[PDB]
Design a protein around this ligand. Structure first.
Ligand SMILES: O=NC(=O)[C@@H](O)[C@H](O)[C@H](O)CO
Ligand SMILES: O=NC(=O)[C@@H](O)[C@H](O)[C@H](O)CO
Ligand SMILES: [Co+2]
Ligand SMILES: [Co+2]
Lengths: 384, 383
């Protein structure tokens, strides 16, 4: 069937989401997430002005050709704006394909590899003690895995944060020791370094946290230069995760083939969608690398639903990040995935199981919001 | 030097251009090119909606902090939309800094390294003979170097058909014919334009060795930088690449492994003066030279800035020149000059280019997309 219409919806039910909807001549439709936190309107414009017009009249079934057509045909390849636009088309087309097949997406991908999908929750606190409090209540909700963060003692437009690597490196290991002491060894414990360290500093932290056996240490260092990971890998056996800021298999091909990481984090909506992420997950699996999808509030329920289908099929699934959306957001994007006892159960409706309530979306207009920046104590613009 | 206002101007004097203007409290102003061919409005929105608001009240003198603030601060780093926005801010700020120094841009960068800037012109025809005709008229205009392309016998993106096999048997004939008619002193360039695999490019490289091309450009898509290795190992024809690149991380390995002779990434797509200086300096460690992409889809803002850059950079190779239309030149008044095949940098403070806003408003945006390429069986290929 041919594409009859395509358009974007921008809405802000708690925060900004951009969605692409594709409608075939028969009236069937699918949607894809296009949300890029803090640069939302770049993608919306990419879609509205440059992609949407070229979609009209194309065969909706040609997912692969459409992917190559937009990826190669853009001429300027890769990039967060570019690949998020491409991902949103791709997700919308897989939705349509699964619908046309009368199957939930995970079936169309090759069927289930697991009965449920393990997640992790964010647990954040100013003091180590405050964080311990959040772990407890998330454990009470059934989470088997938690990502822990505390403050560091002595420390619409972008907020500006101040950062000290040295104080942080001295403090962080104390948090994990406290986590193990209170909660024991069976809990999976994750930590997000969030781009702030140099490699040798990350090597040092990894070694210092070996006794607490983290499920992963994430985003140790900025990794545009993929060799940045080598010194870390050579000095510690703490498992490493990276990639939420990546958008292309070429951002991580060497990290994977050289075995510098244990989990790849690039998610569906930023990583060129289902079509591309299958390739990424498959390359990862030759080297024992597992999936750990970025799943913050700034990817919509459209992505999450699709992510849960993918998580359900993919052989080398690792863990799915879960930052729960607001009630308002869950209402804009009705969905049939379920959360029970710390795990996701994939939906059984044909498609990725997510839709968008356009009328409700129109009640919440766009509100500009930017991500923070980080500066060192001397005012040096650092990595947030 | 606080920024009072910043905004974009979109205009289509023969083709689409997006320009960023920044204006400080004291009234001094600067402009940067933000044109991304076929995706123009993505950059416009990136700038208008996410960058501009954050520029207001910033110290315009803090060029480096602004670059890092936009680069790191975006969180999602690199990419053609991202780095074009960043390049526009950066070029506009260097414009302001040069004006404040009362110097033309090249003086600010370390001064003149050459007296003029050699260019090459495009020479295209349907048959070899049509192309040789174009080569003649461009030599007559004074060009010392020509990029030659001929046809191969046998609002939305246009759709072209392509045959690698027919191209590889045909292309070396073009170069033989150019040498037969024009001799050995003319510099002859060729743009493969992404269509080949590495071993196919290796073959073509070897076939054209007797013709001594100035460069063979964009042999293979190079998101995977290792794609250049088989070519380099099999031919001594010089290799050029990078017009579709936007980061030093797109070509760091290409340079350090000595897989290329000329880096093509231009100011407007390569993060501006601040980033391209660093790329140029990495390249110089390995004898790699600059060969800035210079088509009609980069504005005269970029061209003037590029000519200043070309004038200072030690490892200059060549500057591509596709003449802009008269309407375009009128929208973007400038003090660079073209004479006898070469550019001469302007002497006005700044990069020497301005935009005439009243004139620009007379040419509204018109959507135009780059073509796609398909193989004979329908395969969506590289254009
Ligand atoms: O692993 N999750 C994270 O690092 C998030 O909290 C990110 O800072 C935001 O999603 C940025 O859009
Ligand atoms: O070397 N020059 C070229 O390859 C040009 O003809 C490009 O296809 C266009 O500028 C793309 O925007
Ligand atoms: Co993270
Ligand atoms: Co080219």
């Amino acid at each position: 069937l041919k594409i009859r219409d395509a358009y974007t919806i921008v809405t802000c039910p708690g925060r900004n989401f951009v969605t692409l909807k594709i409608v075939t001549e028969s009236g069937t439709h699918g949607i894809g997430d296009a949300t890029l936190n803090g640069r939302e309107m770049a993608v919306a414009a990419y879609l509205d002005e440059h992609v949407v017009p070229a979609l009209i009249g194309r065969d909706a079934g040609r997912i692969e050709d459409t992917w190559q057509y937009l990826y190669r045909g853009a001429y300027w390849r890769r990039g967060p704006v570019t690949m998020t636009a491409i991902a949103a088309v791709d997700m919308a087309l897989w939705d349509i394909k699964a619908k046309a097949a009368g199957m939930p997406l995970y079936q169309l991908l090759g069927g289930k590899s697991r009965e449920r999908v393990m997640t992790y929750a964010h647990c954040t606190g100013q003091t180590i003690e405050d964080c311990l409090g959040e772990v407890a209540r998330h454990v009470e909700l059934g989470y088997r895995a938690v990502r822990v963060q505390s403050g560091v003692p002595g420390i619409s437009l972008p907020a500006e944060h101040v950062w000290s690597t040295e104080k942080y490196l001295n403090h962080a290991p104390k948090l994990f020791a406290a986590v193990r002491e209170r909660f024991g060894d069976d809990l999976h414990v994750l930590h997000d370094v969030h781009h702030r360290l140099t490699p040798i500093e990350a090597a040092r932290l990894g070694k210092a946290v070996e006794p607490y056996h983290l499920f992963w240490l994430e985003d140790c260092v900025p990794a545009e230069n993929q060799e940045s990971l080598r010194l870390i890998r050579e000095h510690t056996t703490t498992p490493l995760a990276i990639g939420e800021v990546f958008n292309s298999i070429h951002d991580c091909r060497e990290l994977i083939q050289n075995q510098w990481i244990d989990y790849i984090r690039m998610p569906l909506t930023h990583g060129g969608g289902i079509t591309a992420m299958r390739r990424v997950a498959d390359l990862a699996s030759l080297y024992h690398v597992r999936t750990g999808f970025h799943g913050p509030t700034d990817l919509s329920p459209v992505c999450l639903g699709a992510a849960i289908h993918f998580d359900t099929w993919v052989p080398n699934f690792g863990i799915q990040e879960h930052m729960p959306h607001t009630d308002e957001t869950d209402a804009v994007f009705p969905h049939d995935y379920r959360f029970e006892d710390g795990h996701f159960l994939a939906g059984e409706s044909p498609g990725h199981g997510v839709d968008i309530d356009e009328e409700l979306a129109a009640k919440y207009p766009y509100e500009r919001a930017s991500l923070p920046v980080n500066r060192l104590e001397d005012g040096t613009l650092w990595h947030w």
